[PDB]
Each structure stands twice: as structure tokens, then as C-alpha cells.
């Protein structure tokens, strides 16, 4: 988060924000529950009511992550349709305009397919989170039994300190305690391992997607440079278009670079 | 698109796809209309029925782009909630685990706010597309009148070649034609200018967002390195955690780098 020490819900402008004023807030921000509907909210609340207490939060996280994946795939499909129909509109235009919008449509198609691949990786990470949820929520009943048996032992001791069940219940409490402390140890180990692996995978997918999208954007801007933005004076003829070969090579190079990209090929250097 | 010349709906694996097998397709791909509901589809169809013919496609593009923006803001809010509640789950864990998941939550919060900024830029680009739609759809009725008047002139000439209305209608046809050819010229000019500017803005926002997300991912992986993934043997104690200062400096550096990022500071070099 970028907030400086102030009560303001506004952050100090960065270098990009200093370069130009930020655009006004989106006009599509309507008034609603802030999420669109209620069925997924009911699912989330059910995850927050019925599940075991100590696993309830992680089950809710898994459900919300599934919602995020659903929304991401839906918006990827919608972006694909938008690119297709944008190029459809650009078909009946100037030949230069038609070619430029067609190539932009292909680039957005690549962006959509890369989004789909990142979505598959994101679902793999979500499955890992589901696995850690499962193991930890199945290790919870050990401590549940420990708490129940210690409460029963306290109640029996208060009611009848000389009851014969005291010794056997004490052995059982010891046994659940040996079952439980070291189970906590194993749970911590597996939680650390699974969390580290899943988040490393997720961040590798994130950086790969970001770098591929950045390369696509750079190639698209270089190809936009090809577009002739010089206006033609009223009443004049249309100059001939000869950018087929240049955009031809540009899209060829974009595909070649996308094939060539590797995890080590990432040029992002954190400091 | 990455498809090689084959009937396969499968693309040759890239270097990243060669490094490891791709994950299986997402398990959340349910059976439905492929989009979730019907109200937005009705809106899109109304955009594809009632509007002027030559502006109908661009109006549909604007509507679909609004749908994309709505979905993007919804998924950004859901990702924000997911990060918050993930860190909420990580609160009651190991102190190292609590700190690492808290910092990851902050990083995903930054990702969400950057998504919101990119969404604002994307809506600015959508507004530019709306503007070009408006001007071009308002220039369409000139050609509509030209076609109507030429049809009327042909019908009148066939019905009565010596009708007195022939000369005045011919002058009006000339006048609409002088109104229309050069209007086509101006429309081509304004379309080129608006499209180039809007797509340059969109691609600049895209590359900025991608680079910021890539820096966030790199810093997050470097911070995940801080996590102690070494398992502890059963029955042993918990080693003391001392990573507060290291993650302290890591998040400080991440914020500093995010402030320092400029458009020229982008390190992506298309070839
Ligand atoms: O004032 P009203 O009667 O409620 O209608 C609004 C506005 O006048 C436009 O018709 C429309 O924007 P466009 O001109 O771009 O179609 C907008 O839709 P929007 O919010 O989805 O943009 C409507 O909400
Ligand atoms: O086959 P169904 O009837 O569609 O139900 C699916 C599955 O059987 C589980 O109930 C659930 O996973 P869990 O066992 O972990 O709850 C999953 O949710 P998910 O995709 O969010 O994991 C559901 O989609």
C-alpha cells in the first residue's frame, strides 16, 4: 500500500502520476452490493457457517479464490469477444486502418490466451491451497477430541475425584496430547512447505504473464507507430497503403519473442 | 495467436511450456451460456438491433467494453477481499507465517490498486472509443440522405424524365454528394487520429501495469525466500523468528521502486 501517514484515502503521486494527472474515476461504478449478485455470497456464507471452525477461514478463502477464477475466465472470454468484434468493426474502414485494427485484434487474442494460461496456473495454486485446507481441517478434530476429553476429565474430577474412570480418562488425555502436540508440529511443517511452494508457483506465473503482456504491449506500440496518423486535407485522394510487409514482420517478431521467452529470460530486476 | 499450420486446436509449446508440462484445464469451467447471465446479453443485442447500421458495430464494441470494465472492477474488488481474508486466516499461525502472509496480503492489495488505476485508464480509452463512435455515427446520416435522394432521383427519372422536380433534386443530390465525399475524408482522418491516440494510451497503461505487477511479483518472491521452509523434526521446539526487519526493508524497497517507476523506466525491449 502507498498511503503516507495521513488520514487521507489518497496516496502521494508516483513518477507516473507526476507525469500526467490521473484520469477521473470510472463512470461504470454503479450502486449495488458491490459484487453483482447473491448466490456466490450465499456460498461464501455457507463456507463461513457450516465448516469446522479452524478450517472455516481457509475454506472461505478457497471459495473466494474460485469466485476470482470464475470472474477472470469470464472477463478473458469477454476480452476475446471484444477484440474479435473490434476488428470486425475495423474491417470496413481504410485499408491501413483495417490492417492495424486486425493486428491489434490478434495481439489482444494473444493477451486473452496468455490470461487463460495464467488462469490455469492460478487454479493449480488454488488446488494446492485446497490441499493444505484439507490436511489442516482434518488435523483439527485431533485437538477437538483433546479439548472434549480434557473438559470431560475436569468435570469428572469435580463431580467424583475418586471415580474409577479418572485413570483411564487420564491415560486417554495423555494419548490425545501425544497425538496433538506433535500433530501441531507436523501441521506447521506442511503448512510452511505448501504455502511456500504454492506462492512461488503463483508468483512465477504472475511474472511470466506480466512480462509476456509487456512484450505484447511494446510490440503493439511499435506497430501503432506504423499507422499513418497524418491527416489528409479535405477533398484530396487517399495515399496508397504499403504497410503489409512491415506489420507482417512485426507480428512475426512478436510471435518469435513470445516463443523465446523463458523464466530466466525475464528482465525484471528487483532491488 | 500461436497456432502452427495444423487443424489442431493446440499450439506448439514455448520455452516456458517446454520447461514444465502445462497444468490441466481449470476445474471451475462449468456448463452455461459461457457468460453467466442474460441482462448484459440483452443489452448487447439491443445495441445490435436498434442503433444505426454503420454505427451499430461500434456501439456494440462500446457496450462490450463496458461489460469488460465492470467485470474487471468486480474481480479487482474480489481479489482485494481474497487478499484481506487470506491474511486474516494467516493471522492465527506461526509468527513467521503470520508476517509472510500479511506482507503477501499487502502486495496483493497493491496489485488490486494498480488494477484499479489501469481500469481508470481503460475507461478513458473506452470513452475515446465512445467519442469516435459518436462522431462517425452522426456522420452516417449524411450518406443515408445521399442514398435516399439518389433512389428518389432514379425513381422520378424512371416515372417522369421531364418532371420539373428533376433539376432541383439533381442539385440537391450534387449538394449531398459534396457534403458526403469530403465528409468521408474527414471521417477517415478523425478515425485514424482517435484510434491511434486511444490505442497508444491503452498500451501505455497496459505496459505500466504489467511492469508494476512484475516488480511486485519479483519482490514477493524475494520475500518468500525469507520464509524458513526447513521442516522441524517432530517433538521439537519452534526456532525464534527474526525476519521482521528483513521484510521491513523489503516492503520499504518495494514501495520505493513503485514510486520510482516511470514510463521511460520500463525495461521491456521489443525486438
Ligand atoms: O440518463 P439515462 O436515461 O439513465 O441513460 C443514461 C445515459 O443517458 C445514456 O443513455 C447511456 O450512456 P450512452 O450514451 O453511452 O449509451 C447510459 O448508459 P451507461 O451508464 O451504461 O453509459 C444511461 O445510463
Ligand atoms: O461436483 P460439484 O457438485 O459441482 O461440487 C464440486 C466438488 O464436488 C466439491 O463439492 C467442491 O470442492 P470441495 O470438496 O473442496 O468443497 C467444489 O467446489 P470448488 O470448485 O470451489 O473446490 C465443487 O465445485
Numbering used by the authors:
A (entry chain A), B (entry chain B): 1 to 271
Q: Could you pull the original sentences from the published paper?
A:
The yeast eisosome, composed of the BAR-domain proteins Pil1 and Lsp1 (hereafter, Pil1/Lsp1), scaffolds a membrane compartment that senses and responds to mechanical stress by flattening and releasing sequestered factors. MCC–eisosomes are relatively stable, and have been implicated in sensing and responding to plasma membrane stress: various stimuli, including hypo-osmotic shock, heat shock and mechanical pressure, cause eisosomes to flatten and release sequestered proteins to affect signalling or transport functions. Here we isolated near-native eisosomes as helical tubules made up of a lattice of Pil1/Lsp1 bound to plasma membrane lipids, and solved their structures by helical reconstruction.
Although the most compressed protein lattice class retained the pattern of membrane voids beneath the AH, indicating sterol binding, this pattern was gradually lost in the intermediate classes and was blurred in the most stretched protein lattice class, despite its slightly higher resolution.
